Design a protein around this motif. Structure first.
Motif, mmCIF file in Angstrom:
data_model
loop_
_atom_site.group_PDB
_atom_site.id
_atom_site.type_symbol
_atom_site.label_atom_id
_atom_site.label_comp_id
_atom_site.label_asym_id
_atom_site.label_seq_id
_atom_site.Cartn_x
_atom_site.Cartn_y
_atom_site.Cartn_z
ATOM 1 N N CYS A 125 -7.632 -3.654 -1.526
ATOM 2 C CA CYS A 125 -7.373 -4.870 -0.725
ATOM 3 C C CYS A 125 -7.489 -4.749 0.799
ATOM 4 N N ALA A 126 -8.140 -3.695 1.302
ATOM 5 C CA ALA A 126 -8.390 -3.565 2.720
ATOM 6 C C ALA A 126 -9.546 -4.490 3.133
ATOM 7 N N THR A 163 -5.363 -12.443 3.464
ATOM 8 C CA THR A 163 -5.316 -11.291 4.368
ATOM 9 C C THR A 163 -4.198 -11.421 5.403
ATOM 10 N N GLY A 164 -3.443 -10.347 5.618
ATOM 11 C CA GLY A 164 -2.380 -10.351 6.586
ATOM 12 C C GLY A 164 -2.231 -8.946 7.151
ATOM 13 N N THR A 165 -1.449 -8.802 8.233
ATOM 14 C CA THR A 165 -1.203 -7.492 8.827
ATOM 15 C C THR A 165 0.270 -7.204 9.040
ATOM 16 N N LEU A 196 -4.710 -6.335 4.999
ATOM 17 C CA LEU A 196 -4.614 -6.272 3.538
ATOM 18 C C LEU A 196 -4.507 -7.660 2.918
ATOM 19 N N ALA A 197 -5.300 -7.864 1.871
ATOM 20 C CA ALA A 197 -5.350 -9.085 1.084
ATOM 21 C C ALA A 197 -4.183 -8.949 0.113
ATOM 22 N N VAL A 206 4.650 -6.059 -4.004
ATOM 23 C CA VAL A 206 3.586 -6.711 -3.278
ATOM 24 C C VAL A 206 2.642 -7.348 -4.283
ATOM 25 N N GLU A 207 2.377 -8.630 -4.109
ATOM 26 C CA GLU A 207 1.382 -9.282 -4.922
ATOM 27 C C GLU A 207 0.005 -9.066 -4.249
ATOM 28 N N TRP A 208 -0.728 -8.083 -4.751
ATOM 29 C CA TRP A 208 -2.084 -7.757 -4.276
ATOM 30 C C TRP A 208 -3.061 -8.869 -4.660
#
Ligand SMILES: Cc1cc2nc3c(=O)[nH]c(=O)nc-3n(C[C@H](O)[C@H](O)[C@H](O)COP(=O)(O)OP(=O)(O)OC[C@H]3O[C@@H](n4cnc5c(N)ncnc54)[C@H](O)[C@@H]3O)c2cc1C
Ligand SMILES: Cc1cc2nc3c(=O)[nH]c(=O)nc-3n(C[C@H](O)[C@H](O)[C@H](O)COP(=O)(O)OP(=O)(O)OC[C@H]3O[C@@H](n4cnc5c(N)ncnc54)[C@H](O)[C@@H]3O)c2cc1C
Lengths: 574, 574, 104, 52
Positions: A125-126, A163-165, A196-197, A206-208
């Motif tokens: 998820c990057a 996507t978030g950081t 990361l998404a 974490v919900e990937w």
């Protein structure tokens, strides 16, 4: 009969589905693989409580769905068979191997995933953006306009992936590493969280994101979307697109239903191939694009001569480190410790808010609680502390992508003798110059497990900048990693098997002009010469890039969908 | 409020659901794991086209869902850390290990699977009946009545699992090995297909059975069963049952919803525990049955003193062989071969029906076509020939179960250097005497990944008969396997890690009288002293058995459901 | 090409070679036992800087050979042990066993 | 190999590898007892294991 047919249900196909289903097109999607991630179709297999409590087991899940692209004929000598056992006289073709493959010019690590959702069912998820130096041009002779276009597209793609950081901001290990590298490279390099998404659901879960995040892949119309039209057909091998006599249009999609065994032709107005960088190319070659068989420049192909040339794969270096004693002691720098662990008067305290504290209250509270509640444990890091997720992105002075993190791949599982809290993974990714001689081609005699032309690589990392940068990249990893701790025995610094990185690009590459830019699709991802055939995926990306490519491929698919909406009319809902 | 609550959605829970849902009971089932196969809930994960074309990859899937029960504290010496890396001073508790566990008296291979469908989502589907010498008594002093009851139950269980013995009849390899063993042991031992819970769908595709086969796990009422009542609740950890003040009834089940993090009590008329041999015992000890903590014979538990004692696990020996040159040449014994492979002269023919043929026409036809279609291949066996599935069942003169076969386990993957068509797996499974000193117990300080008391084994294979037979069994595998081929280097004859076989029994064992038969449930699987508490699974089996136990556990569960139906009534359908 | 870099270790009192009063070796002599760690501080910092130096220097010649990647070797495999019966001017002030004539 | 053949380890700690695949008939240890010239005085984590 459909308006749009999409081959593949990976995140890129789901981008086309999201865009076109939403705009009212009657859409069908075909996947060779099956639904096998739970009730949320095409979702991330790591989003179970059991995997997030046992993350090292997910390495095994990944291994279980990466099927090698091209395995050369095996030449290991087994000379300790019993004299009675059948013993070979030659190194003959066994076990799905590819006799076309030169084992010394291969991407032996390259593999594919045949499941609904594709590789997004297992990916890490990057989703960074490419800077200009890595990025294909969408507008020539206007850098401002090219920047604005990429910013619009990437913003929308980041929205689709979620996507978030910020998801790791309360991790002690993440902040420990980030802060140390920020200080060590102050005025030279900037470090941040890996984009990361993903969406954090609790401190431990974490919900990937995945293909499902982009488009839920539920058949429509349904209660939630009564006026939309979408059908997903798993266990359907898409074998070829049929060209008209003029080579101006695709007339049908030829499919094999793997459960019934029946073969059918499907008609649509628009055909979208999003089967991955390898399998888009295979399908096109099986359809009469490019050249089938061992390349022969004495007879260049009539259609898309650049197809399968200029392929790029990134160099990858990897190691793991064990956190330095200095860094571990720094974790508890603000603590006053009294007594002896396990005794009545053992006490761990700090002064909240003290201007002389190195760490914020939230960090000190977590450390104090871990140290008081688990007095048998010698480390100050909490047991369920989230993983570090650090990057310094590609720059001209360090032209490789970096991840300083922990996640599940097909390799690098944490082994039991060293505490997992100490371990940090280092993955540096190089950019590879596109060269004509670097090729994916398909046998005219050998076939794969689905009776399609067997893929074969002719690949070496180019001499010159690509090679120089690869080796400087290794050295950079050795130098940077030592600021955090020494190498973990068993995960010493190394180049990974070519292609294990799974970032293959340029197999059906984009450009403005078929001949001048040696390419197969235009900036709308439309195949040159054809009105109604579009390709999506990392195969489109024509540049030397080091960062992770999926977000960029999605951005290109969004742009492609903008063209389709302008040029094709949805049929009436009946 | 429910009529019946079932903890666990493996095949044994599904047996209780099939029976009680089908009789109108309002049923809830909880599983700690999640729905993570496809749309067929709890179905076999190997039933995809991709895994049936790539069966060695399914080994990785199995590895990815076997979570070790009790891992001792690790004592490997890592003395090549950098001097700057944090270095341990002791062998402290790392990475989820169990400090209660003596590494020398463990079942280190024992593991559990937490997914909807349990281990039936990955198992290899072998479902033989136990003969009398392996089987618990259901009727005392009447062997004919005991035989009739077991026949009735096993017949119903075989229908639930769709057990058959015909699915591999047209395999060349199966018949090659079967015929040779039959001839070698003529008048001494009988061989047959392994009875397999499986349905052939095509010459190359087998629908392996699972929990889903037993009961489809769909919520009811639904269109297909409008008067049935069933709800499955995944991601729910069941933690304990509550005993009433006089220890004659269960009053409620305490659960933990893993998604919300909240805990609740669920009320039912009937409570059924089908969480597996280890986890049923865990839940019961967490409920005040048996005793928590390290066993102390000076202070015996008030309730179910035999809980967690007399545990059995089978000895397992394994090797692989490479088919003899003689057997390979016999495959093509009926063929006349003129000319040289690859030439237009080359001809492979046989005479249909000839009295001098060693093999039937179906076999010769497949060999002929393979040899003419693949003239580059040096072997006579067709490429998509189904796997061998041979056994000689447990008898007094060879008191072990045998499988001579190919299938996917967590170990034994076929590598690259030897052709897979040559390779046969040999698994011989010994019976273990139930002994009081062999125990599964639960820590009163250490918890597992779900904050439940940590399982700990105190186990050695009993001296005497068990050990003698286990070594005789090894010898028998060496002698028998040599009739087919020599050992494959890298899979030489060995005992497998204790418990890797995953056939644990006797943790909550059945008998007629709690005290005299040292047991926990009666022959209705009802917990002694309690009106409304039932256990299902291999933990009920009290005998020394070598054959695969699941069909026998299912048969017990059917008998238990007969009791439930005689003693409890559905609530009015509301 | 092989690369071997060798660090210096600060003498510390706590780092010891001692002999068992019970256990004997293959010649029936008192069994040697070590109580040793690389001292924190300069020794450890220099050892990690040395590793990094080897990685940087070696790259000028070529990349690592797979299977011989950069690593710290098992402590003592280098077989350069010193200080077990150390020299100095004064037994007490220099914490030593022999003088500069190597006389006990 | 000549070198290997004349470097005799100075202090080898008691071995704690778990060998749990012995045949049930084979003699099996109940403890990590002193075997094969090992040194029970030796802390495996404060050794010069390579000394010979
Ligand atoms: C371990 C791992 C880690 C990763 N980490 C990263 C990350 O952090 N960031 C990043 O950007 N990328 C990551 N990737 C790569 C990423 O998952 C891929 O780039 C991405 O999924 C590509 O999307 P796609 O839709 O083009 O192709 P895919 O996801 O490959 O999907 C293509 C699909 O089409 C199908 N198909 C193939 N052939 C046919 C055919 N003939 N007919 C019908 N259907 C067909 C497949 O079954 C598949 O579902 C990772 C992948 C792995 C495996
Ligand atoms: C590689 C492999 C090969 C095998 N092959 C064979 C074979 O050929 N033949 C054979 O007879 N056996 C085979 N087995 C074993 C067989 O799968 C098991 O005997 C059988 O599945 C046990 O059924 P069960 O329903 O009692 O338990 P399980 O299948 O273990 O299911 C129990 C369930 O309860 C759950 N659960 C556990 N704890 C809790 C809790 N506290 N709260 C709520 N839910 C909980 C789980 O998540 C799980 O789904 C094999 C297994 C494996 C792994």
């Amino acid at each position: 009969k459909y308006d749009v047919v999409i081959v593949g249900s990976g995140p890129i196909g789901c981008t086309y589905a999201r865009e076109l289903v939403g705009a009212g097109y009657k859409v069908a999607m075909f996947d060779i693989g099956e639904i096998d991630s739970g009730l949320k179709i095409g979702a991330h297999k790591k989003n179970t409580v059991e995997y997030q409590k046992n993350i090292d087991k997910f390495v095994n899940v990944i291994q279980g769905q990466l099927m090698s692209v091209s395995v050369p004929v095996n030449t290991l000598v087994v000379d300790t068979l019993s004299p009675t056992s059948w013993q070979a006289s030659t190194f003959f073709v066994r076990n799905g191997s590819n006799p076309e493959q030169d084992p010394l010019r291969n991407l032996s690590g390259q593999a594919v995933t045949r499941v609904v959702g594709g590789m997004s069912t297992h990916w890490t998820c990057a989703t960074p953006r490419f800077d200009r130096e890595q990025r294909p041009l969408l507008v020539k002779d206007d850098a401002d306009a090219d920047d604005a276009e990429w910013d619009r597209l990437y913003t929308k793609a980041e929205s689709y992936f979620q996507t978030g950081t910020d998801q790791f901001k309360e991790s002690i290990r993440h902040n420990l590493v980030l802060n140390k590298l920020t200080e060590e490279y102050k005025g030279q390099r900037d470090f941040q969280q890996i984009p990361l998404a993903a969406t954090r659901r609790s401190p431990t879960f974490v919900e990937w994101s995945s293909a499902n995040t982009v488009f839920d892949l539920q058949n429509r119309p349904n209660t939630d979307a009564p006026e939309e039209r979408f059908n997903l057909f798993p266990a359907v091998a898409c074998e070829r697109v049929v060209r008209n006599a003029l080579n101006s249009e695709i007339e049908s999609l030829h499919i094999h239903d793997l459960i019934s065994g029946d073969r059918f032709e499907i008609k649509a107005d628009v055909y979208v191939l999003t089967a991955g960088a390898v399998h888009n190319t295979q399908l096109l070659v099986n359809s009469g694009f490019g050249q089938l068989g061992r390349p022969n420049p004495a007879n260049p192909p009539e259609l898309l001569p650049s197809l399968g040339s200029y392929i790029t794969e990134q160099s990858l270096v990897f190691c793991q480190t064990v956190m330095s004693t200095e860094l571990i002691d720094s974790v508890k720098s603000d603590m006053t410790i009294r007594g002896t662990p396990g005794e009545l008067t053992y006490s761990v305290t700090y002064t909240p808010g003290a201007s002389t504290n190195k760490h914020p209250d939230w960090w000190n509270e977590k450390v104090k609680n871990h140290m008081m509640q688990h007095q048998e444990d010698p480390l100050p890091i909490p047991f369920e502390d989230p993983e570090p997720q650090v990057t310094t992105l590609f720059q001209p002075s360090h032209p490789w992508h970096t991840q300083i993190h922990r996640d599940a791949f097909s390799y690098g599982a944490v082994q039991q003798s060293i505490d997992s809290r100490l371990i940090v993974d280092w993955r540096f990714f190089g950019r590879t110059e596109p060269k004509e001689e670097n090729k994916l081609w398909f046998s005219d005699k050998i076939t794969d497990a689905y009776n399609m032309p067997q893929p074969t690589f002719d690949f070496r990392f180019p001499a010159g900048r690509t090679s120089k940068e690869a080796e400087d990249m290794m050295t950079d990893m050795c130098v940077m990693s030592a600021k955090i701790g020494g190498f973990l025995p068993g995960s010493l610094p190394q180049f990974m098997e070519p292609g294990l990185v799974l970032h293959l690009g340029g197999t059906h590459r984009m450009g403005f002009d078929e001949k001048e830019d040696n390419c197969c699709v235009n900036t709308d991802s439309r195949v040159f010469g054809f009105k109604n055939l579009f390709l999506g995926g990392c195969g489109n990306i024509p540049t030397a890039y080091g960062a992770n490519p999926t977000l960029t491929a999605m951005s290109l698919a969004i742009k492609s969908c903008e063209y389709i909406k302008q040029n094709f009319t949805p049929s009436p809902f009946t």
